[PDB]
Assembly symmetry: C2
């Protein structure tokens, strides 16, 4: 009974959809679930080739300073969320620093290279680590990736501002790690 009859690490009904949270200067300005496998984060949706879903950054309510930085996105940021995990590719001139499970060690800024793909989260490692965790033999695996967009302001007191931040995760990972907390919640009531 092999090979192609083998069972997968996760059922076929798995939800690898991308949960996005957009943050302007410390405040959450909105959430978006993306069910397509790939998408492009964009300042505004254009006619474009149309090879991908375009995901528009929210309109910033105080309007600026964030709108000045949204206007530098140009082609923006590619994101892929699939059975393998989460991938991103910076297309914009803006520096993007990232924190995610696959990040290298150190404090220093992990910066997304221009025009190059980066795997932020691996479903195979998360799944292996989650199983050891629930067997009490490990720490809980991480699953959230965060992109931090930066802008220079020479002459202000904060010479670099993280004006915009994007948190990303796959739906299935959050679901599995909320099952025990959800039971604890129900017991409080």
């Amino acid at each position: 009974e092999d090979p192609v009859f083998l069972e997968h690490q996760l059922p076929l009904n798995s939800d690898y959809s991308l949960l996005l949270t957009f943050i302007y200067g410390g405040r959450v300005v909105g959430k978006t679930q993306v069910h397509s496998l790939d998408c492009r984060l964009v300042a505004e949706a254009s006619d474009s080739e149309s090879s991908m879903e375009q995901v528009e950054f929210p309109k910033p309510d105080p309007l600026e300073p964030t709108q000045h930085l949204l206007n530098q996105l140009d082609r923006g940021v590619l994101v892929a969320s699939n059975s393998r995990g989460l991938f991103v590719q910076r297309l914009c001139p803006i520096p993007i620093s990232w924190n995610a499970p696959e990040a290298p060690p150190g404090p220093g800024p992990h910066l997304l290279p221009s025009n190059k793909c980066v795997e932020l989260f691996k479903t195979t490692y998360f799944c292996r680590d989650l199983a050891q965790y629930f067997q009490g033999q490990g720490p809980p695996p991480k699953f959230q990736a965060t992109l931090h967009f930066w802008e220079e302001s020479p002459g202000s007191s904060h010479s670099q501002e993280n004006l915009i931040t994007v948190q990303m995760e796959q739906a299935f990972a959050r679901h599995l790690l909320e099952k025990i907390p959800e039971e604890e919640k129900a017991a409080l009531f």
Copy 2:
């Protein structure tokens, strides 16, 4: 924009579900759509490990001779229907001969080896051939696979009987090749 952002040969909404047709001695005794990725063709569903969907052969109406042959299926036949195509593995002592797109050339019987996996249909070849076909530069690709189960009857006039036959195809392939015929049908009325 690569690699993982690439576009697939077929949309993500693709229906690779397995369409089964069961035939006892020349008559169709039933049809079954299987939406699981793998399944086991069985005489009757048992408690079993439960690692797969079990698909029961129909109860034969005249009852026999076919029931004698269904009772030799033992563990039966594994089938996998996925984005790669159609795969089968004979678990039964019954000889199964097959006709499908990947069959070798010749008339002679193509027999499924015991405890060994056989790819009957490849979505990559079908898709490449279909495109050339619709461009008028090729013949239409085939997509149906047929398994022929056999039983000896020394002393009858047909010393080998093909009592049971199973036709298999993936839903998407039939759909695409019926689109033009469906238009022709509508024009007749």
